[PDB]
Amino acid sequence: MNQGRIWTVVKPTVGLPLLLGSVAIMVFLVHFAVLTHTTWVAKFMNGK
Amino acid sequence: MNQGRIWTVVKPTVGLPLLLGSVAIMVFLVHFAVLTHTTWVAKFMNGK
Amino acid sequence: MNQGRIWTVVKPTVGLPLLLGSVAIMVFLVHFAVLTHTTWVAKFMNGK
Amino acid sequence: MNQGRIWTVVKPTVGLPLLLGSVAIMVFLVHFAVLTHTTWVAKFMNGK
Amino acid sequence: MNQGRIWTVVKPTVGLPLLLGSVAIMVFLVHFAVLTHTTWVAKFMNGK
Amino acid sequence: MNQGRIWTVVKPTVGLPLLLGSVAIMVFLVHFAVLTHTTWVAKFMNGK
Amino acid sequence: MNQGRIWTVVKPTVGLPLLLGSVAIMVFLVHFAVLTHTTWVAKFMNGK
Amino acid sequence: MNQGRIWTVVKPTVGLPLLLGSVAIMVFLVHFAVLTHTTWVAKFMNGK
Amino acid sequence: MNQGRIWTVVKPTVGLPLLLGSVAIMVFLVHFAVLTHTTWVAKFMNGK
Amino acid sequence: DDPNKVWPTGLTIAESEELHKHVIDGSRIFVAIAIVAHFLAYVYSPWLH
Amino acid sequence: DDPNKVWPTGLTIAESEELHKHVIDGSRIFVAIAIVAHFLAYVYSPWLH
Amino acid sequence: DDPNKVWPTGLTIAESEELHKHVIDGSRIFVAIAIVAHFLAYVYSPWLH
Amino acid sequence: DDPNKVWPTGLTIAESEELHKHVIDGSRIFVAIAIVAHFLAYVYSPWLH
Amino acid sequence: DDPNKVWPTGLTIAESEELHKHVIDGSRIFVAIAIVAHFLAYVYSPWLH
Amino acid sequence: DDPNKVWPTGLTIAESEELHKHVIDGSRIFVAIAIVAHFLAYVYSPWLH
Amino acid sequence: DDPNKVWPTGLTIAESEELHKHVIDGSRIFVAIAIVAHFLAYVYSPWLH
Amino acid sequence: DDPNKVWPTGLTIAESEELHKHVIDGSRIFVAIAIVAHFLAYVYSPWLH
Amino acid sequence: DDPNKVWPTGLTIAESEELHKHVIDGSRIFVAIAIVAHFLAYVYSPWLH
Amino acid sequence: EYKGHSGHPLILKQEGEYKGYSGEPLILKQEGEYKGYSGTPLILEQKGEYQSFSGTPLILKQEGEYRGFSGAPLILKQDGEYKSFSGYPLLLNI
Ligand code: BCL
Ligand code: BCL
Ligand code: BCL
Ligand code: BCL
Ligand code: BCL
Ligand code: BCL
Ligand SMILES: CC(C)=C/C=C/C(C)=C/C=C/C(C)=C/C=C/C(C)=C/C=C/C=C(C)/C=C/C=C(C)/C=C/C=C(\C)CCCC(C)(C)O
Ligand SMILES: CC(C)=C/C=C/C(C)=C/C=C/C(C)=C/C=C/C(C)=C/C=C/C=C(C)/C=C/C=C(C)/C=C/C=C(\C)CCCC(C)(C)O
Ligand SMILES: CC(C)=C/C=C/C(C)=C/C=C/C(C)=C/C=C/C(C)=C/C=C/C=C(C)/C=C/C=C(C)/C=C/C=C(\C)CCCC(C)(C)O
Ligand SMILES: CC(C)=C/C=C/C(C)=C/C=C/C(C)=C/C=C/C(C)=C/C=C/C=C(C)/C=C/C=C(C)/C=C/C=C(\C)CCCC(C)(C)O
Ligand SMILES: CC(C)=C/C=C/C(C)=C/C=C/C(C)=C/C=C/C(C)=C/C=C/C=C(C)/C=C/C=C(C)/C=C/C=C(\C)CCCC(C)(C)O
């Protein structure tokens, strides 16, 4: 809440696609991490 | 629905291909994740 | 059929190669997914 | 044979390399797919 | 705190995204390293 | 031999690097394919 | 220290990011090399 | 020796870095090929 | 020592980063090659 | 000027909001199809059984 | 102006919609071939047997 | 000048801070949704059991 | 006039159609070669035996 | 001249140094959060036990 | 113009056809070398034995 | 001429060498920290034992 | 005229053929070094033994 | 012209040769450090023992 | 001049021509037509319309609006405003 001038020095058409894309990528990385290093997520997907 | 001004600062010829492509990529990631970490999808593909 | 104006804001020389190329990629990804997670496609390729 | 106006909107110096390049890439993907999922191609390469 | 003339010679719209992006990437690399070379992190993810 | 006009619409400083580079890439792919799916090439490299 | 004219012929906004990025990349490559080819680092990470 | 005009249509600042870099890359590919598909190179590196 | 005119046709801000970067990359390739195809480097890293 | 300002993307606020109207509608159609696919999985797959 | 406006992509709305006419037609031909391919897979593969 | 300065990105300070206000509020929404997902995982997964 | 418009790619429709005339002819020759390759595979490989 | 020079990045020195003051302060907060995350891992993980 | 039109690549048809004359000659030499490499593989490798 | 020449990067030799002074000083600090890191490894790790 | 044509790369035919003169010389040196390396391998490795 | 001609890279032949002077010097220093590393490896590693 | 730390000379040059090390000729010159090494012709000339292989027709002509192969309509028109397929509102605004 004090970094709001960053868009005077970083182009919004760069920083906003990078910000949203990075969060999207790294959400998927945490899912794949927890998916591959646990049993219970695969059990939930496999169900009955 | 309150983000409608995003396209005043992100170029549509950038953000729209990025949006549609990122969704298509991450749709396939969820299919591959569930396909590899379950038995029933492969059984469905293998059929009889 | 209601998205017909997309080419007023996404450049055809960008979005048309991206569309056709992404579809070709998606086709091959599905073939590889089914080929690797089934026996019958490999048996069909392997033949007699 | 009705798409001949594609080159009024996709630059040939982009789309013709992308066309021929994608065809060559995907020819190789099919050879690698069949090579890795059959015995008889390797037997043909291995010969006597 | 003596490098602050770096932004007279590196463009902030290049260096700030590269800085924040590289930090985020390498945070994840350290998590993936410790996750894949320990038992207790996977044990924590796997819970009971 | 009838495609001689291709260089009026594809830039030579693009298509000639891409032509020669793609041939070089795909020569190596065929070598790696035959190398990994035969014994006699590895035997020839290993010698006595 | 005798290479100080490098920045008259390499753009600082290219070479300084390439320098610091390459250093950070290759620091991580060394940590991964030692982490994967030793036991004592993993034992240190694994702790008790 | 008859291809000397290639540099009238391919930019030297593209084709020379690509020529040298492609040879260097593909030199290393032949080393890694023989290194992985023989015993005697590993013996030579491992020594006594 | 007779190639000193290379920089009249290859841009220094391209060729010098490519030269130094290629050398640094391929140094690491040789270290990883020897590290993975010998025991004594791993023993040296592993110590006692 | 102000309400008719062309922003650096080459769009007005109205053109931007009209464009986003397609984005919201497409997102809602996507979710609706996905809900049916999840319901089909709930019926035919072992997922939540 | 507007119906003859040239947009930042260099197309009018009419040219954009004429281009999309090929996109929709190609998509429908693609699905038609894919439907036959799935029908052939249903006949010859064990998929749904 | 200063408050009206158009910076090289094409934004004023006020435009930059209004844009970031969407970024901040969007981050707060993301955190709230993630907090619920962690609460759900605490309830239904073995994670901290 | 419409047929003599030079489009943003720098081509006329007639030049574009002459270019595509090479693309279609190449595609037909490619398929003809591929048909013989599949026939040779049918004769000599176990594929459909 | 010199203290009012605009450099090829489009900043003065003072603008550059004020920008870096955010980068330094952000680095300190990142370090401070990481220190506590390391302290928490020391308390709850086997790492140094 | 037409018979001496400089196309957007900066070549005439004659310069393009001259360039492609090298591309064809190189392709024929490449195939001739590859044919002898296949003959050597036929003589020395088990490939077709 | 020579000391006042602005080279294609937009720097004088004096500004180029003053920039490199930071590059050298940064390299020295990096090496100093790395030396201590190898000393700490020599004390606590089995590396050279 | 013709031999003094500056082609789109910024070189004359003469400068192009001069540049290629270094390329052919470098290629020949590379092959000579490689011929020795293959001879050394023939002497000191089982390759053709 | 030739001794003073500026080439498309923005260098004279003289400045190109002065730049390459640093490249050759750096190459020699690199090989010198590598030869010492090779000697240390011949001493301490089993490589040629 | 740069001294370096690795002795002298650091570069070689000559006034007349490239003094290559691997003998001479280093290149072949060409005063006329391209002298290929794989016989002739190397290319086929085109005097007019493209004399294709693989038979004719080779494209389909168009002299009006696009005709679909998959039935009409191909496009839904719009006037006034975007019709929602998913109810209203589609936006929130100030
Ligand atoms: C060794 C440190 C420096 C070095 C310092 C010097 C010096 C000093 C000189 C040259 C000179 C020459 N250099 Mg130099 N040079 C190095 C690297 C190189 C490399 C390379 C691929 O590494 C090359 C091709 C060259 C090229 C050359 C020639 C152009 C020239 C004549 C060679 C000669 O026989 O001199 C004669 C032979 C020698 C100088 C070497 C004698 C070695 C003796 C027998 C052993 C000494 C052992 C020493 C005490 C061991 C401990 C310390 C270190 C481990 C070295 N240099 C390194 C980077 N170079 C010469 C010059 O400029 O002439 C005008 C010259 O005098
Ligand atoms: C050897 C060091 C140099 C070399 C130095 C010379 C010299 C000197 C001359 C030529 C000349 C010629 N060179 Mg040259 N040349 C080299 C590399 C090449 C290559 C290549 C693919 O490597 C090619 C195609 C050519 C091409 C040619 C021809 C244009 C020309 C006549 C052929 C001939 O018999 O040359 C000579 C022979 C060879 C290049 C190779 C012979 C190979 C045989 C099979 C083995 C020789 C073993 C040797 C005696 C062993 C001991 C000494 C050293 C350990 C090498 N050069 C290397 C890089 N070249 C001649 C010319 O016309 O100049 C105007 C000439 O006088
Ligand atoms: C073989 C060495 C050269 C070559 C040299 C020649 C020569 C010389 C001539 C042609 C001619 C022709 N070439 Mg050519 N050509 C080669 C590769 C090719 C390839 C290819 C895909 O590899 C193709 C499609 C062509 C195409 C063609 C036609 C345009 C034309 C008539 C063919 C024919 O049947 O002639 C008749 C048959 C042949 C040329 C093949 C003969 C095969 C015999 C068994 C062995 C030949 C030995 C060889 C000539 C010896 C010297 C070279 C090396 C030492 C191997 N060339 C290679 C790169 N080509 C001819 C023409 O009409 O020119 C006006 C002609 O005179
Ligand atoms: C076969 C060699 C050539 C070829 C040569 C011809 C000729 C010659 C003619 C056409 C004609 C036609 N071609 Mg064509 N054509 C080929 C590939 C294609 C392909 C494709 C996807 O491969 C398509 C869609 C078309 C499309 C068409 C139509 C526009 C048109 C009418 C159909 C017809 O019955 O033709 C005729 C038949 C066929 C295209 C296929 C017949 C195949 C038969 C069953 C097997 C022949 C084997 C052959 C003798 C083997 C040895 C020689 C060579 C190895 C081929 N061609 C290949 C590249 N084509 C006609 C035309 O436009 O006339 C003005 C015509 O007379
Ligand atoms: C089959 C070849 C063409 C095709 C030929 C036609 C024709 C001809 C007409 C339409 C018309 C219509 N088409 Mg169409 N159409 C195709 C693909 C599509 C697809 C799609 C996703 O594949 C869609 C959504 C549409 C959409 C539409 C509507 C706008 C319209 C009214 C449909 C209707 O129910 O008519 C009534 C039903 C039909 C036309 C066909 C019903 C087909 C049934 C359901 C399935 C049969 C499968 C068959 C066995 C497959 C194998 C045989 C062949 C190998 C294809 N077309 C393919 C590519 N279409 C009509 C229109 O309004 O024109 C003004 C019309 O006259
Ligand atoms: C289902 C097909 C369409 C759809 C069609 C409609 C229709 C039609 C309307 C809305 C309306 C609204 N839609 Mg919508 N909408 C869809 C997807 C969405 C999604 C989403 C994430 O998927 C969201 C958030 C919204 C958002 C909204 C709100 C702005 C608004 C009020 C909703 C409400 O609760 O009304 C109250 C509840 C309802 C409208 C749903 C009642 C369902 C009843 C109980 C069951 C009907 C079954 C039916 C007979 C089955 C066969 C036909 C079809 C398969 C539906 N839509 C999909 C893509 N939407 C309304 C609006 O804006 O009015 C001006 C409205 O009338
Ligand atoms: C792989 C294995 C096993 C081990 C590897 C372990 C290793 C090597 C770990 C290495 C870790 C390292 C190197 C970590 C480094 C972390 C660093 C450098 C963190 C840096 C953080 C920086 C931050 C948060 C920067 C923030 C910047 C901000 C907010 C900038 C704002 C700018 C603004 C508002 C513009 C203002 C402009 C003006 C003009 C003032 O208005
Ligand atoms: C890998 C594992 C195991 C787990 C990971 C699970 C996770 C994290 C899953 C996450 C899933 C997520 C985040 C899904 C998100 C989906 C989303 C956001 C979907 C969005 C869809 C949007 C769509 C379809 C948008 C369409 C837009 C269109 C058609 C726009 C058209 C524009 C046009 C015509 C231009 C109009 C121009 C004017 C001038 C206004 O006329
Ligand atoms: C992976 C598995 C198991 C199997 C896959 C097997 C497969 C699919 C293999 C496929 C192989 C294929 C497709 C091989 C294709 C090879 C081809 C097309 C080779 C082409 C070679 C072309 C060459 C050598 C071109 C050379 C061009 C040159 C020298 C051009 C020079 C131009 C110059 C001098 C410019 C002149 C300019 C002017 C203005 C005229 O002066
Ligand atoms: C894979 C295996 C097993 C083994 C491989 C091991 C290997 C090969 C390891 C190799 C390691 C190597 C090569 C390490 C090299 C490290 C190096 C070169 C480090 C360099 C560090 C450089 C640094 C920190 C540079 C900092 C630069 C700075 C701060 C620049 C500031 C510039 C500013 C403020 C601009 C000033 C502007 C003006 C106007 C002049 O004031
Ligand atoms: C993977 C396996 C198992 C096997 C593969 C093994 C193989 C093939 C290994 C191959 C290794 C090779 C090819 C190694 C090559 C190393 C080389 C070429 C190293 C070169 C080093 C060059 C260096 C250090 C150059 C430095 C240049 C510098 C400092 C330039 C400075 C320029 C400046 C100051 C600008 C001056 C400007 C003016 C105006 C003139 O003053």
Tab-separated table of N, CA and C in Angstrom, chain F:
chain	number	residue	atom	x	y	z
F	1	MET	N	12.156	-26.618	-57.433
F	1	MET	CA	12.661	-25.840	-58.526
F	1	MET	C	11.634	-24.828	-59.123
F	2	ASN	N	10.385	-24.906	-58.679
F	2	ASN	CA	9.360	-23.950	-59.074
F	2	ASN	C	9.008	-22.974	-57.954
F	3	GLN	N	9.635	-23.150	-56.794
F	3	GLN	CA	9.383	-22.313	-55.629
F	3	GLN	C	10.313	-21.108	-55.543
F	4	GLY	N	11.040	-20.796	-56.618
F	4	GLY	CA	12.084	-19.783	-56.583
F	4	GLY	C	11.652	-18.410	-56.103
F	5	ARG	N	10.360	-18.093	-56.180
F	5	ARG	CA	9.872	-16.790	-55.743
F	5	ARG	C	9.622	-16.695	-54.242
F	6	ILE	N	9.752	-17.801	-53.504
F	6	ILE	CA	9.552	-17.798	-52.052
F	6	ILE	C	10.300	-16.648	-51.378
F	7	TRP	N	11.490	-16.312	-51.875
F	7	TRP	CA	12.311	-15.255	-51.291
F	7	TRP	C	11.848	-13.844	-51.639
F	8	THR	N	10.795	-13.687	-52.440
F	8	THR	CA	10.141	-12.387	-52.550
F	8	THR	C	9.201	-12.108	-51.386
F	9	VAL	N	8.777	-13.140	-50.662
F	9	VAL	CA	7.801	-12.983	-49.593
F	9	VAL	C	8.316	-13.457	-48.241
F	10	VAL	N	9.337	-14.311	-48.196
F	10	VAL	CA	10.041	-14.658	-46.965
F	10	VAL	C	11.435	-14.048	-47.006
F	11	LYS	N	11.774	-13.291	-45.967
F	11	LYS	CA	13.072	-12.633	-45.896
F	11	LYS	C	14.196	-13.665	-45.884
F	12	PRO	N	15.189	-13.539	-46.770
F	12	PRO	CA	16.328	-14.473	-46.747
F	12	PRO	C	17.064	-14.526	-45.419
F	13	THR	N	17.239	-13.387	-44.749
F	13	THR	CA	17.859	-13.352	-43.427
F	13	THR	C	16.998	-13.985	-42.341
F	14	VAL	N	15.820	-14.495	-42.685
F	14	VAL	CA	15.030	-15.352	-41.805
F	14	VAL	C	14.996	-16.790	-42.318
F	15	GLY	N	14.570	-16.985	-43.566
F	15	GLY	CA	14.318	-18.325	-44.069
F	15	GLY	C	15.558	-19.153	-44.343
F	16	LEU	N	16.665	-18.515	-44.737
F	16	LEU	CA	17.910	-19.269	-44.892
F	16	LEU	C	18.495	-19.721	-43.559
F	17	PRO	N	18.610	-18.875	-42.527
F	17	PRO	CA	18.961	-19.412	-41.200
F	17	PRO	C	18.011	-20.488	-40.698
F	18	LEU	N	16.701	-20.297	-40.872
F	18	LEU	CA	15.729	-21.308	-40.461
F	18	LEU	C	15.827	-22.587	-41.285
F	19	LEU	N	16.050	-22.481	-42.595
F	19	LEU	CA	16.242	-23.682	-43.405
F	19	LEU	C	17.466	-24.471	-42.951
F	20	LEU	N	18.641	-23.839	-42.981
F	20	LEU	CA	19.877	-24.524	-42.609
F	20	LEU	C	19.857	-24.988	-41.156
F	21	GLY	N	19.381	-24.135	-40.249
F	21	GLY	CA	19.245	-24.532	-38.855
F	21	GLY	C	18.303	-25.700	-38.619
F	22	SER	N	17.153	-25.711	-39.295
F	22	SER	CA	16.216	-26.824	-39.146
F	22	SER	C	16.777	-28.133	-39.691
F	23	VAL	N	17.484	-28.084	-40.820
F	23	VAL	CA	18.149	-29.280	-41.335
F	23	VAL	C	19.191	-29.796	-40.347
F	24	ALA	N	20.029	-28.901	-39.822
F	24	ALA	CA	21.019	-29.293	-38.821
F	24	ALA	C	20.374	-29.877	-37.567
F	25	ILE	N	19.345	-29.213	-37.036
F	25	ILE	CA	18.618	-29.745	-35.882
F	25	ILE	C	18.085	-31.146	-36.165
F	26	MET	N	17.430	-31.323	-37.309
F	26	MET	CA	16.751	-32.579	-37.611
F	26	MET	C	17.686	-33.689	-38.094
F	27	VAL	N	18.842	-33.354	-38.671
F	27	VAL	CA	19.911	-34.344	-38.829
F	27	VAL	C	20.313	-34.937	-37.482
F	28	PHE	N	20.530	-34.083	-36.483
F	28	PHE	CA	20.896	-34.561	-35.151
F	28	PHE	C	19.792	-35.392	-34.509
F	29	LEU	N	18.535	-34.991	-34.691
F	29	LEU	CA	17.415	-35.793	-34.201
F	29	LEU	C	17.390	-37.199	-34.794
F	30	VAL	N	17.628	-37.337	-36.100
F	30	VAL	CA	17.696	-38.674	-36.693
F	30	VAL	C	18.878	-39.478	-36.151
F	31	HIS	N	20.038	-38.842	-35.963
F	31	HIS	CA	21.162	-39.536	-35.330
F	31	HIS	C	20.827	-40.003	-33.916
F	32	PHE	N	20.311	-39.104	-33.075
F	32	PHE	CA	19.917	-39.490	-31.720
F	32	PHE	C	18.821	-40.552	-31.708
F	33	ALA	N	17.892	-40.500	-32.662
F	33	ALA	CA	16.884	-41.552	-32.776
F	33	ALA	C	17.513	-42.919	-33.038
F	34	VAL	N	18.321	-43.024	-34.094
F	34	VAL	CA	18.948	-44.296	-34.448
F	34	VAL	C	19.966	-44.728	-33.396
F	35	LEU	N	20.705	-43.772	-32.831
F	35	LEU	CA	21.643	-44.074	-31.752
F	35	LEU	C	20.962	-44.704	-30.542
F	36	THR	N	19.817	-44.173	-30.126
F	36	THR	CA	19.151	-44.684	-28.933
F	36	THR	C	18.281	-45.909	-29.185
F	37	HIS	N	17.974	-46.242	-30.439
F	37	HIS	CA	17.140	-47.401	-30.737
F	37	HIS	C	17.870	-48.476	-31.536
F	38	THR	N	19.201	-48.481	-31.512
F	38	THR	CA	19.971	-49.594	-32.050
F	38	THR	C	21.080	-49.945	-31.070
F	39	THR	N	21.607	-51.161	-31.214
F	39	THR	CA	22.844	-51.562	-30.553
F	39	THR	C	24.094	-51.259	-31.371
F	40	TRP	N	24.011	-51.376	-32.698
F	40	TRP	CA	25.218	-51.423	-33.519
F	40	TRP	C	25.914	-50.070	-33.611
F	41	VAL	N	25.177	-48.968	-33.471
F	41	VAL	CA	25.814	-47.654	-33.463
F	41	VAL	C	26.618	-47.453	-32.182
F	42	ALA	N	26.020	-47.776	-31.033
F	42	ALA	CA	26.746	-47.721	-29.767
F	42	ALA	C	27.935	-48.677	-29.745
F	43	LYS	N	27.772	-49.877	-30.305
F	43	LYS	CA	28.904	-50.786	-30.469
F	43	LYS	C	30.000	-50.184	-31.341
F	44	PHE	N	29.622	-49.561	-32.458
F	44	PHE	CA	30.602	-48.900	-33.314
F	44	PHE	C	31.330	-47.771	-32.591
F	45	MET	N	30.616	-46.985	-31.784
F	45	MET	CA	31.289	-45.969	-30.979
F	45	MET	C	32.157	-46.591	-29.892
F	46	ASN	N	31.678	-47.664	-29.261
F	46	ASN	CA	32.428	-48.277	-28.170
F	46	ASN	C	33.635	-49.054	-28.679
F	47	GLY	N	33.579	-49.539	-29.916
F	47	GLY	CA	34.683	-50.228	-30.548
F	47	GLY	C	35.029	-51.522	-29.837
F	48	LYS	N	36.318	-51.845	-29.834
F	48	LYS	CA	36.804	-53.054	-29.176
F	48	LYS	C	36.585	-52.996	-27.667
